[PDB]
Amino acid sequence: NRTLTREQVLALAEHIENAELNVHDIGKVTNDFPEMTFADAYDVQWEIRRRKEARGNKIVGLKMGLTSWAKMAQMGVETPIYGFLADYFSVPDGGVVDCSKLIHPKIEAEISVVTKAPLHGPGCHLGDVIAAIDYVIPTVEVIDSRYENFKFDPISVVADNASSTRFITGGRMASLEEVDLRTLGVVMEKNGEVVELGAGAAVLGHPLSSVAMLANLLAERGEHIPAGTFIMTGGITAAVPVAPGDNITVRYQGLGSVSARFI
């Protein structure tokens, strides 16, 4: 289920990571490696993770992508994927994001969880996840594919760490029993007006199903979700482009709001 040589995995990881670190797009890597598999692509992603760890970055969480109809439709792919979150991705509520470090960024409204017990696949179900949730965190992702025109096939996107680049936490961060993640309403405002909205159920029917799916995907590589992991469960709505001068506010039903501005 692999077609890359080890040398190619290491070199592709450097190439793709450099596009992020040096703020430029690249061609879809499947153009040069058309036989590349998902296992190849995740090898590349985890090697990028290793590069970041080796230079001292902490990995502060994981994200699930392409979990909602809206995001599947927008990106043309219907296969859920995951990627990792590095510490310097983090942005404080109300913070300023420097777009000069970004290529062609978009924002997504999500709900995140922090776990308090390990989760393992395979065969992880919704009922296995519930007690492992410590609390929930309103989170806006900034995604920024390193591929030109934000156009990819899923294998390329996995290799590019599922387009991850920034995330903004905010609002009220409460216990799971206090928050219905299925019916949680989310309203995205940009420059003072509503531009997107949705409910948590858009994420695979229930955001906690995304957590179960992540455990199952990780198990394919012998990995799991350690206790204390921050997980972004997926874009509830279509992603919206942002640019210098923009301000955004995402309102979470009963949980306040997350805001940011861009320069």
Using an 8 Å Cβ cutoff, are 136 and 179 in contact?
A: yes
Using an 8 Å Cβ cutoff, are 107 and 71 in contact?
A: no
Q: Does 235 interact with Mg ion (rule: CB under 5 A)?
A: yes
- Smallest distance from the beta carbon of 239 to ligand OOG, in angstroms? 6
Candidate ranges 50-58, 96-104, 107-115, 125-133; the one touching Mg ion (CB under 5 A): 107-115
Is 108 marked as a binding-site residue? yes
Residue 157 interface partner, choices Mg ion, ligand OOG, none, CB cut-off 5-8 Å depending on type: ligand OOG
Q: Which is nearer to ligand OOG, 8 or 156 (CB)?
A: 156
Q: Which is nearer to Mg ion, 8 or 259 (CB)?
A: 259
Using DSSP's 3-state secondary structure scheme, residue 181 falls into coil
Radius of gyration from C-alpha coordinates of the chain: 17
Q: Under rule CB under 6 A, which residues in 133-192 are in contact with ligand OOG?
A: 141, 143, 145, 157, 162-163
Distance between CA 49 and CA 55 in Å, rounded? 10
Distance of CA 106 to the CA centre of its chain: 12
Q: How is residue 234 written in tokens? A: 């997926």
For residue 145, CA distances in Å to 36, 157, 256 come to 18, 7, 29
Q: How is residue 139 written in tokens? A: 């989170």
- Smallest distance from the beta carbon of 142 to Mg ion, in angstroms? 9
Residue 160 interface partner, choices Mg ion, ligand OOG, none, CB cut-off 5-8 Å depending on type: none
Q: Does 209 interact with ligand OOG (rule: CB under 6 A)?
A: no
Amino acid 156 reads: S
Distance between CA 1 and CA 40 in Å, rounded? 8
Q: With CA atoms as reference, report the closest residue to 233 among 191, 190, 201.
A: 201
Q: Which is nearer to ligand OOG, 110 or 246 (CB)?
A: 110
Is 101 marked as a binding-site residue? no
- Smallest distance from the beta carbon of 167 to Mg ion, in angstroms? 8
CA atoms within 13 A on the CB side of 237: 23
Q: Does 108 interact with Mg ion (rule: CB under 5 A)?
A: yes
- Of 141, 144, 153, 189, the one binding Mg ion (CB under 5 A) is 141
Binding residues (CB under 6 A) for ligand OOG: these are: 63, 65-67, 71, 75, 108, 141, 143, 145, 157, 162-163, 234-235
Residue ranges binding Mg ion (CB under 5 A): 108, 141, 235
Binding residues for Ca(2+), as ranges, are: 108, 110, 141
